[PDB]
Amino acid sequence: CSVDIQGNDQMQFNTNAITVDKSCKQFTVNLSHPGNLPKNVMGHNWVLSTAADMQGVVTDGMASDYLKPDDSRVIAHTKLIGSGEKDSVTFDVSKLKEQYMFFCAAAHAAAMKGTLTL
Ligand SMILES: [Cu+2]
């Protein structure tokens, strides 16, 4: 009923998929970032929400640890960790049901994009 998640300076997760065994009443995410943060990203966290609400959470974090205080869409999140730092978050699995998304709120990319060629 637990997992170790890691990020790096290439904006990669050690895994982009997490399974929660149904015997679990609580689940714990263990976050660490042993190497450097990505360039000009000064923090790393792990955030859980619905697939629908993810974008809202992200936009509102930049509008207001890159997260809106007491955001009701955020199921669970770690604090912002630096390089070489570590944090854990444990949450009640009862608040879940089903295709949820987890993300880091500190490293942003362009939401809207396309291709151009000559
Ligand atoms: Cu941003």
Q: Which of 8, 111, 99 is nearest to 51 (CA)?
A: 99
Reading the block at residue 20, the tokens are: 């929660």
Phi, psi values for residue 26, rounded to 5°: -130, 150
Q: 105: how many CB neighbours lie within 10 A of its CB?
A: 23
Resolution of this entry in Å? 2.3
24, amino acid identity: C
Max Cα–Cα distance, the chain, nearest Å: 56
Q: How far is the CA of 32 from the centre of ligand 1 (A)?
A: 22
Can you tell me whether residue 81 is helix, strand or coil? strand
- 13, 6 contact by CB (below 8 A): yes
Beta strands in the chain (DSSP E): 2-6, 26-32, 47-49, 76-77, 86-92, 101-103
Please indicate if the annotation marks 33 as binding a ligand: no
Name the burial class of residue 31, with classes exposed (0-12), middle (13-18) and buried (19+) by CB atoms within 10 angstroms of its CB: buried
What's CA 73's distance to the chain center, in Å?
Answer: 13
Q: Which of 74, 19, 23 is nearest to 46 (CA)?
A: 74
Query: Where do the structural domains in the chain lie, given as residue ranges?
Result: 1-118
CA distance 59 to 78: 18
- 43, 82 contact by CB (below 8 A): yes
| Experimental approach | X-ray
Q: How far is the CA of 24 from the centre of ligand 1 (A)?
A: 34
Could you tell me which CATH number the domain at 1-118 has?
2.60.40.420
What 34-41 contacts at long range (C-beta under 8 Å, 24+ apart), as own/partner pairs, is 34/6, 34/83, 34/84, 35/8, 35/9, 35/83, 36/8, 36/9, 36/83, 37/9, 37/82, 37/83, 38/8, 38/9, 38/10, 38/11, 38/107, 39/9, 41/11, 41/106, 41/107
Q: How far is the CA of 108 from the centre of ligand 1 (A)?
A: 5
Q: Which H/E stretch holds residue 97?
A: none
